[PDB]
């Protein structure tokens, strides 16, 4: 509606992991109708009022306090599009917020941290509308998830160990589309962990499973890669209008 005349849709790079590509109707509503991936959490919105108080104590001035003409050395930071201050040390600025985010202190289901160097802009958005999903945290080209935590997952059927306790351990975190752009993503903790032949060893995040890009009807057909790519989209229109 708000914008037309020679504006195709096609496929965007940000659709990976967020929207199921092989799930669209076969009629005239193809491309326009979107869906959701298998593992994806939708933001609901939060108030960045306890967050703003902590940032002011970590060496940060105010707009109506100093002058921007004599500060051309620090890096600006944005909160919901508005400027809140700067920080003379941009290295430990994002590193301190990252450690507290993994210690059950910052809401990982809404607050997202983004660090950029080309634009020198640190944007932080906590409003509803973004799509986030958990990923495997990779530290020092190795998987942070310990084998001992696998036994605790089976204890849920006997004692108590829900998903809330695993997020507080610091091995998993919700990553949206903005934070994923400024970080590195891996495939599987096996081939990329080999120090023999590897072009880069600076991985930060990793996918949960390669089959997470599919949706509800897309996960019904076995082996979607061995078939033709447009033929996989017809399955979502057939399984919906079927009996059973």
């Amino acid at each position: 509606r708000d914008g037309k005349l020679a504006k195709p849709r096609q496929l965007h790079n940000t659709l990976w992991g967020m929207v199921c590509p092989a799930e669209t109707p076969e009629g005239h509503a193809v491309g326009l109708v979107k869906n959701l991936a298998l593992m994806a959490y939708i933001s609901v919105g939060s108030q960045p009022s306890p967050i703003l108080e902590f940032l002011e104590e970590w060496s940060m001035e105010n707009l109506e306090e100093i002058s921007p003409a004599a500060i051309a050395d620090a890096t600006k930071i944005f909160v919901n599009g508005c400027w809140v201050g700067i920080h003379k040390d941009p290295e430990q600025l994002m590193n301190t917020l990252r450690k507290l985010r993994r210690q059950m202190d910052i809401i990982v289901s809404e607050v997202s941290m983004i660090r950029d160097i080309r634009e020198r802009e640190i944007r932080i958005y906590t409003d509803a509308g973004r799509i986030c999903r958990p990923l495997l945290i990779v530290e020092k080209q190795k998987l942070l998830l310990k084998k001992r935590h696998i036994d605790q997952l089976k204890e849920r059927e006997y004692n108590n160990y829900s998903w809330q306790d695993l997020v507080a351990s610091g091995v998993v975190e919700y990553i949206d589309t903005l934070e994923e752009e400024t970080v590195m993503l891996a495939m599987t903790p096996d081939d990329l962990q080999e120090k023999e032949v590897a072009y880069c060893s600076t991985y930060t995040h990793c996918e949960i499973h390669p089959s997470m890009i599919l949706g509800v009807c897309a996960s019904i057909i076995p082996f979607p890669d061995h078939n033709q790519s447009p033929r996989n989209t017809y399955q979502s229109a057939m399984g919906k209008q079927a009996m059973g």
């Binding site: 108080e53 002011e56 105010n62 109506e64």
Partner: protein, 176 residues
């Protein structure tokens, strides 16, 4: 030297009740105004805040959000009484007049939130050695203002200036 060897130790006290308020009067280091060249000053309140009064011209005056008391539903109903003059008891900027009236006039905008995150305390050097704390009540940032100017005629010379923009400022001040 004395600023890199002397080690002192004093006592700081924070009084509870006071007999006078405490504020901050900021200037500008880019102007470099000598403080010893000031003889007298008349620091009073703002005068431009006591000018506007009537504002019952709607929607004749315009609008794009239907600001009728903020309801954008009904219309008319002569009862806009909502633009009453209230130069707060404390929300009015100061008006400094150094050396007469047309000598040196300053004007600044009052800061919004002053005790939202932190507070400002003023420490003074008492003759006995101890320190006294002065709680800051409000913040101010004065700006330099020109003297007598008055360009005169803003609605009759602006339409003709944008049409061609072929004139000089020397022909405007001479007519006045």
């Amino acid at each position: 030297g004395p600023s890199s060897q002397n080690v002192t130790e004093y006592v700081v006290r924070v009084p509870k009740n006071t007999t006078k308020k405490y504020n901050i009067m900021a200037f500008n280091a880019a102007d470099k105004v000598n403080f010893a060249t000031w003889n007298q000053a008349r620091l009073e309140r703002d005068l431009s805040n006591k000018k506007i009064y009537q504002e019952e011209e709607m929607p004749e005056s315009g609008a794009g959000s239907e600001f009728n008391r903020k309801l954008r539903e009904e219309a008319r109903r002569k009862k806009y009484g909502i633009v009453l003059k209230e130069f707060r008891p404390e929300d009015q900027p100061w008006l400094l007049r150094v050396n007469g009236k047309s000598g040196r006039k300053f004007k600044g905008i009052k800061k919004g939130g002053v005790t939202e995150n932190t507070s400002y305390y003023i420490f003074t050097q008492c003759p006995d050695g101890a320190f006294e704390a002065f709680p800051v009540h409000n913040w101010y940032n004065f700006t330099p203002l020109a003297r007598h100017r008055t360009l005169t005629a803003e609605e009759a010379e602006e339409e003709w200036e944008r049409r061609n923009k072929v004139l000089n400022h020397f022909s405007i001040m001479q007519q006045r």
